[PDB]
């Protein structure tokens, strides 16, 4: 007797999204998941699945579903896929080479851009190594690019690791904001708590 409709509304229709560097994960459990409200929509321009068919999900049960949400610019949406490189894949959000799930993205220019520019969405520009799959780094220490310690002062080879996107309405589509939801489907030797409406 799994409990209530899965809160995909809270994820997809959140008034603000997370910065990609501090990407949000909602663990979805103990609920009936209506996936048809997603794949029957014309509002999602990217809905790329790997190993999972959306159509079968309404008749399938999982131990857990994971919804990762964040904002990136249009040109970077191709980096949210297995075996990709770039600032986002390397330093912000990394899918594993063997990622099984769906990447959902839509243009959010109407929500996340403002006249004068919205700069509240950040990404990590600098890191000493690439993220492991599904790793999250929200550290805000000065990036020491050289051999000399920074001692809390920015300067030569001493840079802040985070940078604003400049989301303005008049941006080219590549530089417009895109909201992203990565659905991971978990199946363990445990009771299934996330089932489609057809059980």
């Amino acid at each position: 007797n799994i409990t209530n409709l899965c809160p995909f509304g809270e994820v997809f229709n959140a008034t603000r999204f997370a910065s990609v560097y501090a990407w949000n994960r909602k663990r979805i459990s103990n609920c009936v998941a209506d996936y048809s409200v997603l794949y029957n929509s014309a509002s999602f321009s990217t809905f790329k699945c790997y190993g999972v068919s959306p159509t079968k999900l309404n008749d399938l049960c999982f131990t857990n579903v994971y919804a990762d949400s964040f904002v990136i610019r249009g040109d970077e949406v191709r980096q949210i896929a297995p075996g990709q490189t770039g600032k986002i894949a390397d330093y912000n959000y990394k899918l594993p080479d063997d990622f099984t799930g769906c990447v959902i993205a839509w243009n959010s220019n109407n929500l996340d851009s403002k006249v004068g520019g919205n700069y509240n969405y950040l990404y990590r520009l600098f890191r000493k190594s690439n993220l492991k799959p599904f790793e999250r780094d929200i550290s805000t220490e000065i990036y020491q690019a050289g051999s000399t310690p920074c001692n809390g002062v920015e300067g030569f080879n001493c840079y802040f690791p985070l940078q604003s996107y400049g989301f303005q309405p008049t941006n080219g589509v590549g530089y417009q904001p895109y909201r992203v939801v990565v659905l991971s489907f978990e199946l363990l030797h445990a009771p299934a708590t996330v089932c489609g409406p057809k059980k």
Partner: nanobody, 123 residues
Framework: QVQLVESGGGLVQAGGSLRLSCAAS????????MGWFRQAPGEERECVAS????????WYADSVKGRFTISRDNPQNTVYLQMNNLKSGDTAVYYC??????????????????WGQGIQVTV
């Protein structure tokens, strides 16, 4: 490799009907969103129409809406662009594009994975 073969282009005059077709090999056509892009010789690539894997959902650019119809024949791995009421400003190289394993309705160039060589339509 993924091969997108476009035909049905060439010369027409204003008010004339031209039917572009794009035959796909190896993009798992059935689970691919398909798109038609055009590029005028002094402009940049714009998406003019796109269609979902089932052929239920369609998107059209404002400049061609009501005049162009996109459709698909999944058993034949072919997407069509019926272009009616052509005006002189439709003249461009038309590219068919595949967004593979995409269950959405893409319209941005970066959301597509494979491109045809493109066919000249001069009105």
């Amino acid at each position: 490799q993924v091969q997108l073969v476009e035909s049905g282009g060439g010369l027409v005059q204003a008010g004339g009907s031209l039917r572009l077709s794009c035959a796909a090999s190896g993009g798992t056509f059935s689970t691919a969103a398909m798109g038609w892009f055009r590029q005028a010789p002094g402009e940049e690539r714009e998406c003019v129409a796109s269609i979902g894997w089932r052929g239920v959902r369609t998107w059209y650019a404002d400049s061609v809406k009501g005049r162009f119809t996109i459709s698909r024949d999944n058993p034949q791995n072919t997407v069509y662009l019926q272009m009616n009421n052509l005006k002189s400003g439709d003249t461009a190289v038309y590219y068919c594009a595949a967004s593979v394993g995409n269950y959405g309705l893409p319209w941005a160039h970066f959301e597509y994975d494979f491109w045809g060589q493109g066919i000249q339509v001069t009105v």
